[PDB]
Amino acid sequence: MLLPKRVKYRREHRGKMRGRAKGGTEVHFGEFGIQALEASWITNRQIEAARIAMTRYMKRGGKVWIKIFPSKPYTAKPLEVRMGSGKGAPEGWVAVVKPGKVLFEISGVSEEVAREALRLASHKLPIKTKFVKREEIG
Amino acid sequence: AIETKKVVVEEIASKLKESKSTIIVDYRGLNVSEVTELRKQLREANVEFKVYKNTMTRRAVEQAELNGLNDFLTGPNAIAFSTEDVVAPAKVLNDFAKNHEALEIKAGVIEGKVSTVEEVKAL
Amino acid sequence: KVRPSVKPICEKCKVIRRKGKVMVICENPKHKQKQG
RNA sequence: UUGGCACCUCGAUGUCGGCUCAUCGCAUCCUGGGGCUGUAGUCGGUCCCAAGGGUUGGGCUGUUCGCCCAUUAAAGCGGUA
RNA sequence: CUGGGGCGGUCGCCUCCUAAAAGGUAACGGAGGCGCCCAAAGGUUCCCUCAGAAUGGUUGGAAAUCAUUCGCAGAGUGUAA
RNA sequence: GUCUUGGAGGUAGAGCACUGAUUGGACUAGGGGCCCCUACCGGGUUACCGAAUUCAGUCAAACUCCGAAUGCCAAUGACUUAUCCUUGGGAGUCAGACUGCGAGUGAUAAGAUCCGUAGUCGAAAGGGAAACAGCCCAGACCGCCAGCUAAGGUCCCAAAGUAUACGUUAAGUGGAAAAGGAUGUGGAGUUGCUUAGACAACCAGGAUGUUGGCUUAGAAGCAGCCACCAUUUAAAGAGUGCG
């Protein structure tokens, strides 16, 4: 449950999501994360559906990171009214999610805890996923 | 399998100071039955007189291909090594002559091991 | 039971694909599932 | 269903609801047959197959709906301008 | 004008975005403003450079002023981009 | 028009150079907590918020230090091509639709509305797509019982291969839908164990202390908080799971 504090504008365009994200296709702060696979809008409530239902399964766990952040106001005209006549009420918030962008990072956790604590948040997120760990070179 | 090297090396030492040995059954290995072959030996001395069940024909009978080759014909039979370093046999060879005849597993149609050069009647 | 996500629950459950239907069969008869 | 759009019809496509006459879809109310039961028998919940048949007489309101009277194996929804 | 009309709202002028790397380029799309003001806030000559920050001080204060460095501009440029 | 060459412009992308928004860590001006005292100066406790600043890392139509692809404006060298400029006479249309690409409104709904760009229809017949104004191919001066091809096809309807090679699927998929689910299945690859004897399957046994220190009437294996371990050991979790 997060929202941007004071935005430059209250009603914004919807954009065209395509291609790979500009950056952050690589978990680097913590150990294990989920990387998304499709392009989608992720609302505010679903990261709230994530940071809860990971700390269910992460009773004594490390810090849970979220590299996503919502800044796009998805917008509704009030229902059962005609087309046109002004752009509608800002219905809440919605985040920018390209495919390939590693969503979360979770640290202080072994393999086998991270294959279910990170799995159950992916049932709440509307995007097909894959588990992604780290790598050195480097 | 470098772990299998080390089992070969150490058990030879109680086979070059050895005189006698006896067949030991491996089916129905009760905990109290292990006590009635170890703690009667622990009333004698320490674990010199052995119970070990690492006794495949291909694991630990490759090790005993030197000393007293009277034992291979219980190859497809239940084997456990009982080797001796001290306290010559006057009492120890008849450890199995009381319990196994009816209790702590069956007598076992045992065909024996090295007594002098024979098969049956471990005395 | 009948559901599209057929899974074993406890480790006493086998997963036997009868008749084109991924059925799970177990000891305890509340594991009895099927997608169909 | 309330809707959005205005694409058949404004040299006419009769709009609510009843009475008749139905068919049909089953996402099933029964009846037939089963898994589970937090199923002792009795009576159930719930999930399965199954459309062949049955699926009421009122009071009120124009009412569909709704509540209530008493029965019933039950008093199913829904399309067909 | 209109997502039928009515009621609401707008009708003209300047700036931005939507505008697709010339330039235009729509909607009841997204933001602001404009019906003035300056006898100098005009012309020219000749000077000089900001805002903020830190350091220390007079009532001195989170800040009016005053000094030393920072400070390519985060200041102003009448009024708004 | 096409190639060379010269340009203007800040888009798509990107990245943070600013305007913003933001994740996390160090840093801690200030604050609060808690006490001492404050009758006042003040001090200490922070796993309490926290401005700067800094190490990384995200994201912007109204953000650009940067900046493409085409597109437009021209030159002078050509290599094709028939168009263009003025002038006058003469009218029609100033409601368009659909498809793709880029956009807004919309709910990244609509055979939705409203722009750019390109096509077609409209004003276009023929073959495809079963029939189909907008898709695919292609332009009907007229006759031929001429030939070659495009889109699409080549068992019967219905013209043309039961074509040829190598595979895949078993559902009628083809011949209509996702999150998810599965020892379905073909390839590619990685590793564990493994005749120094693996994986199942069978004859085996399960630890002594001990529930072990604290407990609920006791529960001694799972009341539950935990050092949760030393001996007999081929072994045995101070217990695999059912009770």
Output the six-digit token pair for A113.
């805890």
CA B72 vs CA A41, B5, B17, B52, B118: distances in Å: 75, 21, 20, 17, 13
SS3 C15: strand
How far apart are alpha carbons B37 and B34 in whole angstroms? Answer: 5
> CA of A18 and C1' of F67: distance in angstroms?
20
- Of chain C, the end-to-end C-alpha distance in Å amounts to 10
CA dihedral A114, A118, A119, A123 (to 10 degrees): 170
Contacts of A93 (CB under 8 A, 6+ apart): A2, A3, A4, A43, A44, A70, A71, A72, A73, A74
Report residues 11-70 of B contacting strand F, contact meaning Cβ closer than 7 Å.
27-31, 34-35, 38-39, 41-42, 46-47, 50-54, 56-59, 62
* Phi, psi (deg, nearest 5) at residue A106: -130, 130
Q: Output the CA torsion sign for A62, A63, A68, A72.
A: positive
Are A72 and A95 in contact by the 8 Å Cβ rule? The answer is: yes
Nucleotide nearest to A11 (CA to C1'): E30
Who's near B111: CB < 8 A, 6+ residues apart?
A: B23, B73, B74, B119, B120
Interatomic CA distance for residues B105 and B27, integer angstroms: 8
Rounded CA-CA distance A103/A33 in Å is 7
Listed resolution, Å: 3.8
| DSSP code at position B72 | G
- Nucleotides on chain E that have an atom closer than 7 A to a protein CB are 2-4, 8, 27-31
Measured between alpha carbons, how far is residue B48 from residues A7, B15, B42 in Å? 83, 11, 10
Q: What is the three-class DSSP state of C18?
A: strand
**Amino acid identity at B46:** N
**What is the distance between the alpha carbons of residues C29 and B116, in angstroms, rounded to a whole number?**
63
A11 strand E contact, CB < 7 Å = yes
**Experimentally, how was this structure solved?**
cryo-EM
Strand partners, C26: C13
Q: Is the sign of the CA dihedral C1, C6, C9, C15 positive or negative?
A: positive
Tokens 């674990």 belong to which residue?
A: B47
* Secondary structure, 3-state, B29-48: CCHHHHHHHHHHHHCCCCCC
Cα–Cα distance, A61 to A57 (Å, whole number): 9
- CA proximity to A117, closest of A62, A74, A46: A62
For chain F, which bases have at least one atom within 7 A of a protein Cβ?
A: 13-15, 19-25, 56-63, 102-110, 112, 171, 179-184, 194-197, 203-208, 232-236
- Rounded, the Å distance between the CA of A81 and C1' of D9 is 26
Residue whose entry in the numeric block shows the structure tokens 């490390």: A62
